[PDB]
Design a binder for this molecule. Structure first.
Ligand SMILES: CC(=O)Nc1nc(C)c(-c2csc(N)n2)s1
Ligand SMILES: [Cl-]
Ligand SMILES: [Cl-]
Ligand SMILES: [Cl-]
Ligand SMILES: [Cl-]
Ligand SMILES: [Cl-]
Ligand SMILES: [Cl-]
Ligand SMILES: [Cl-]
Ligand SMILES: [Cl-]
Ligand SMILES: [Cl-]
Length: 173
């Protein structure tokens, strides 16, 4: 239909971002494909975006999956989502030095914890070892969250708009 011809709607974008993370991480977890997706919020991720390959791409579960396929140019690092775009892939993030992080967790988890210690980003990790999905926020790790738990956290942290009249002009950034 005609809606979408002239712009996009922030709450549609936010729910689509959540759905894209949920579907891609489920797809990857079932197949034991590791992944690392960091969603920028109020704290900028711009410097870490610059360390990766720029994509500036529309968000989809399909593109997120294709990025993380092992042994490919884009898989070795973080995807960073900024606004309504996959900004970069194969980005560096700071590694946490915390001795509280379990030694059985790998670089993706330590990078997710590291970025969470210095930004307000929300970061999602898929373990290649177990398929467990984890999330970091504010220096804390939520390990092996269920699909229901992941859904509730993503809604609370990434949706900032309630049920209201749709408009391409809402909450401009
Ligand atoms: C200082 C430093 O190394 N930072 C890193 N960030 C990320 C996102 C990394 C990563 C994920 S998966 C892989 N092979 N490497 S390493
Ligand atoms: Cl429109
Ligand atoms: Cl839209
Ligand atoms: Cl898909
Ligand atoms: Cl498809
Ligand atoms: Cl580092
Ligand atoms: Cl892993
Ligand atoms: Cl297994
Ligand atoms: Cl589950
Ligand atoms: Cl309008």
């Amino acid at each position: 239909g005609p809606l979408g011809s002239y712009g996009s709607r922030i709450e549609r974008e936010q729910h689509h971002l959540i759905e894209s993370i949920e579907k891609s991480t489920q797809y990857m977890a079932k197949r034991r494909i590791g992944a690392l997706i960091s969603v920028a919020r109020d704290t900028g991720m711009d410097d870490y975006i610059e360390t990766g390959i720029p994509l500036n791409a529309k968000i989809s579960s399909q593109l997120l999956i294709n990025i993380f396929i092992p042994n490919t140019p884009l898989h070795d690092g973080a995807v960073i989502i900024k606004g309504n775009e996959i900004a970069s892939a194969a980005s560096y993030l700071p590694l946490s030095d915390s001795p509280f992080l379990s030694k059985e967790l790998g670089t993706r988890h330590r990078a997710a914890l590291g970025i969470s210690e210095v930004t307000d980003s929300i970061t999602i990790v898929v373990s290649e070892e177990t398929g467990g999905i984890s999330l970091t926020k504010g220096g804390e790790l939520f390990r092996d969250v269920s699909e229901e738990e992941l859904h509730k956290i993503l809604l609370k942290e990434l949706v900032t708009v309630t049920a209201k009249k749709p408009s391409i002009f809402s909450k401009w950034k």
